[PDB]
Symmetry: D3
Subunit: 202 residues, 6 copies
Amino acid sequence: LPALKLALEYIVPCMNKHGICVVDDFLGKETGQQIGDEVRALHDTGKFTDGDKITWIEGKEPGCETIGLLMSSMDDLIRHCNGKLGSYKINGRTKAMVACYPGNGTGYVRHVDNPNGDGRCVTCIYYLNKDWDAKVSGGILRIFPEGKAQFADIEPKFDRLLFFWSDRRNPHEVQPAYATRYAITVWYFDADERARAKVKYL
Amino acid sequence: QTKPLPALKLALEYIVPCMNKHGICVVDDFLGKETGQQIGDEVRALHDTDKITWIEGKEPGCETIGLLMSSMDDLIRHCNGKLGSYKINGRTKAMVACYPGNGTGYVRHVDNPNGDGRCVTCIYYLNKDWDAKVSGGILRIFPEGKAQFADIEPKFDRLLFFWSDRRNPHEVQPAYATRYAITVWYFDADERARAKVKYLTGEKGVRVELNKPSD
Amino acid sequence: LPALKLALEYIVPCMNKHGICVVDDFLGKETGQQIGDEVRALHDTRGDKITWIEGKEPGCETIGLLMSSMDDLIRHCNGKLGSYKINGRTKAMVACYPGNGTGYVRHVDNPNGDGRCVTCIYYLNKDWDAKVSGGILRIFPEGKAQFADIEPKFDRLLFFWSDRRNPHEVQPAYATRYAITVWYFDADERARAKVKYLT
Amino acid sequence: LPALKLALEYIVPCMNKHGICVVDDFLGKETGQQIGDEVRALHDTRGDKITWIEGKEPGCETIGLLMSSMDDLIRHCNGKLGSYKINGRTKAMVACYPGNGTGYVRHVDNPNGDGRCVTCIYYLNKDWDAKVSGGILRIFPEGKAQFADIEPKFDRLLFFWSDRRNPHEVQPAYATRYAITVWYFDADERARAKVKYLT
Amino acid sequence: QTKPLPALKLALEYIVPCMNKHGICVVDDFLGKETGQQIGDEVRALHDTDKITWIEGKEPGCETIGLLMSSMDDLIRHCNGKLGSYKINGRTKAMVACYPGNGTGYVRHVDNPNGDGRCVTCIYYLNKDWDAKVSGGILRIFPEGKAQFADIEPKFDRLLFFWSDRRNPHEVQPAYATRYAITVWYFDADERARAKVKYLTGEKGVRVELNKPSD
Amino acid sequence: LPALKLALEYIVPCMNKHGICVVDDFLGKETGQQIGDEVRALHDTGKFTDGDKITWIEGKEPGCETIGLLMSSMDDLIRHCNGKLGSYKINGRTKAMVACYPGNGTGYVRHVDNPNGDGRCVTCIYYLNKDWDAKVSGGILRIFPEGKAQFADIEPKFDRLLFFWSDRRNPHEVQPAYATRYAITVWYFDADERARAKVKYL
Ligand SMILES: O=C(O)c1ccc(-n2[nH]cc(-n3ccnn3)c2=O)nc1
Ligand SMILES: O=C(O)c1ccc(-n2[nH]cc(-n3ccnn3)c2=O)nc1
Ligand SMILES: O=C(O)c1ccc(-n2[nH]cc(-n3ccnn3)c2=O)nc1
Ligand SMILES: O=C(O)c1ccc(-n2[nH]cc(-n3ccnn3)c2=O)nc1
Ligand SMILES: O=C(O)c1ccc(-n2[nH]cc(-n3ccnn3)c2=O)nc1
Ligand SMILES: O=C(O)c1ccc(-n2[nH]cc(-n3ccnn3)c2=O)nc1
Ligand SMILES: [Mn+2]
Ligand SMILES: [Mn+2]
Ligand SMILES: [Mn+2]
Ligand SMILES: [Mn+2]
Ligand SMILES: [Mn+2]
Ligand SMILES: [Mn+2]
């Protein structure tokens, strides 16, 4: 299951078909647990902006190589879909939103990542909660594809990667959880949208 | 053999009042393990011989399915005109459906919103030993104008009745294992007619010719 | 404009980009008046009245004309209209609405896939000021961040998808209203519909 | 923790920032058990059962105790609790829920301003695994982009606004459930309520 | 004088069946111009002597308002137990309300969702010569489980009846001129009782003392 | 009715009360019609980005002095509310979104200007449609204040200025219109929100 294959053979169609792509075992046990620890590190040192504990990583951070690995690893796959994903000309990506979600019975109401057209067109999420039994611990992502007669409960299973369109096509809510959960989110811009979105400023 | 079905008593003394009061009626241990597992096989067979398929009941390798349908009919028969104001004159084929276990769920919806004639939805679950607590697949019903709602388990050998119009909206929680169910809709004499008139059944129509004579 | 041009250069793209298409001055005040007269006369032989017309019936010639000219447009869009293979049609729903002060709740024509894929409406209300008598059709094209109010303008023709893509509500009217409606079936879908019924 | 500290240092701010406040280990497994026994015994003299308790009745002493200790918390929050002037209370709604597989539809306690401003619930279900038996209370704090699932944990006390600010639904239970509920009235509001009724 | 009111015929032959069938009933030219304009003055007077006020009917300068109420009662009286299954044993005071003309509207809502005893909302419009086409203020009702909805004009000397439970949700379009209306709710014997029991009326209560004896 | 008065005496309270402030006759007939023409100018020359004809003005544009007047005129009022409007520390503002709305029966579904927290906290709109009879031509703004039992239909009357919070508190839809209408929209940032919103990028 090589790199460009996953991209042009599974992602692109599965995405242009439904608008949701799941990828199990993206980096492997050892490589994943690595990030798994590397993220728990940041949970202590500080600089964690924003309960709702999140923080933004650029990849070249002090000692956060593996997070950078993951990021730069996703970049490949998205690059390998150039012009294939809808009419979207994808170029840049936000910094990695490494987030530690509370898990105290807290859930997040349904919403849309990019309803205004702020540029973000492909949400990309990585789950790193080792042995996160969603059957008991809960904390599942639920997506309601606009105009479809079905919906999907995606579990934050360990070492799972998830893609979906960020616009009004994918409204989604997150069932609450009872244990602490970690996850890394990333968005990708459409060259035109991200640009048009910038004429507002000075 | 099959479990004895006192269709008359079960209709008049239980199903009818239940339906009238609540609009939802469950009947467990409908055909017994013996017939149930059998239908299990019969349906898992058609898998070979989200996908569905329609059955009249006479098809080969579908004997017990036709049996199930005949039982459903047996129950609706002894209801008479007591089951709501509806006069049930007929029904659809049996929708034998294979639902996948990929964590897929079904949005809130209503079987018959347009008024196409269907008045009573009827479902039968044949999943041998299905723990809804483990695999999910629960069916959530919201009885219109009530302060409660109900999570019905797709328990093995369970039969489910409910009105199909705006009165019973429902969701289907995702399942994490393949699941099987047979659905049937009963028609109200009048509504089905006006439906056929209004072209809400897709049965009628008018041919559109390839061309017309100029002028 | 010829039917082919109107079809291929206007209707097909308008229907693909939006799923809603208006066509003003379809048959001209000349023929439109006759269609109107036929209908008004037809509905003299206070809720909403509807009588289905084949087109061949007496005193319903011009109605049939309208239907024919509709079918031609549909012929020119054959294959190019969405992803549908249209082979069927419904009788002309000649409908006389009350105009008392009651609108029709927001809904969708074909929610369960009964075969119908294109709703096609023709208005006959001469000098109908929507800002005075109302009866406006509000459509909410699913997905699009805008919505539209279509006025029952005389001699107006209106196409739109029948599925969940175009839910819509009718604003109340304060005067007698007339509108002929037809639906078109997708060859496959309508056939897939019949399957559930007994032989 | 003393009632005053718990009141002024925890409940008042928690109620102001959110309008929802949980308090675990309110009376301890010691007294909680007795409250439970009183209730369970009380409900032996399959839909949901409810019997209102004043607290003074026989075999309902400990219930009354719970009520008292609730009132004290309310006394310590006097004036500081939202913008309400609490002067009244309802009898203890001792409720036994079925646990058959039926939840209670999403709703709001006080939608028309009947006087009630604070819903206050105390759970008595020993060793109640919400992940096995369910019966969870899901609240949607209006305005906030999050929502919460409150587990009917034994000896748990739960405060929340009764108005449109906190709509909420109860997940179905798969075992017999017990929960005592009380509401508090805002002096003005409840008085403004009576006005509409005849002398 | 006032217009003759055949309360008996109007109740039995029109209002009752109308209500039962649709759940909404309008009665125009209820009291005639004479009494109508009078109530006009009577209410515009209380403005002096979004604001509201409650009236029993006996208040000075409210004679014709009490009259209006007595008429409403007259009509509901001759309904008997025919008006739904409800047994109307009483009602609220008359809510005389002054609605402002600042382009303010009222969200979709339901008078009695909790089940507080109110079963029938009753409204009377006294706006001398109000063109709803010009100033708006229309009341839109959505009869639960129906394919139509209705825009009721707050026409002068108009009386309006409808169920107050989940069956009749409604919106009020904004008005661009001051508007006046008198509302009244009738109680169902049973529901009001269970309501008083459930403390849904705010009437009952329990005193909370300033302090308690320590220990 | 001087400048700082309108600000601290009417805006701030009316805003902290409801979250919607209307101001009739902001610049006056002659001064308003001026913008009224100055905007119709741009409708021809070009450079109108984005039917839905809109364009972004910085105020110092060629010959667009009066638009700049309006912008710089609003700036005063918002400056005169420093720290008074909620807990919002307002600093910057987007470029003026001068928009020519179609008016062919087109309406805009209800929405929220800033549901994600992109910085914008105060929507400010100026209407310049001379004698725009909304009774006939229509095209009215309808706002549904979150948690309130009433809603408001604000007419785009000529020379009217409108303020409202942009976040989830003010969902709003626009009734369709039948004639061409022009309007100038502006947003204001909360120093903290606009800042936090920027950690995403690189
Ligand atoms: O900044 C934004 O627009 C923004 C950020 C995050 C976000 N999402 N989406 C799904 C999240 N999630 C939470 C737990 N599991 N998943 C989550 O946090 N959506 C939008
Ligand atoms: O064609 C129709 O009208 C139609 C089809 C399906 C359908 N439903 N609803 C809930 C179903 N389900 C799935 C699993 N367990 N239950 C199911 O099959 N209802 C109506
Ligand atoms: O059978 C159905 O579901 C069904 C039938 C008709 C219908 N339509 N369509 C357009 C209508 N209209 C336009 C102006 N006044 N009325 C109208 O009533 N929508 C749905
Ligand atoms: O009268 C009313 O509207 C009314 C009454 C009770 C009520 N609540 N509140 C908390 C309940 N609950 C908690 C766990 N199981 N049930 C519950 O049923 N909500 C509203
Ligand atoms: O207290 C209550 O339950 C209560 C109050 C008001 C109310 N409504 N509803 C529509 C009203 N209206 C306003 C103008 N024309 N009609 C009006 O007054 N309904 C119920
Ligand atoms: O870019 C954005 O997020 C954005 C831009 C504009 C916008 N709004 N709001 C009200 C508009 N309008 C239209 C007619 N009358 N008013 C309008 O255009 N909302 C959000
Ligand atoms: Mn998200
Ligand atoms: Mn269904
Ligand atoms: Mn329609
Ligand atoms: Mn409740
Ligand atoms: Mn009301
Ligand atoms: Mn906006």
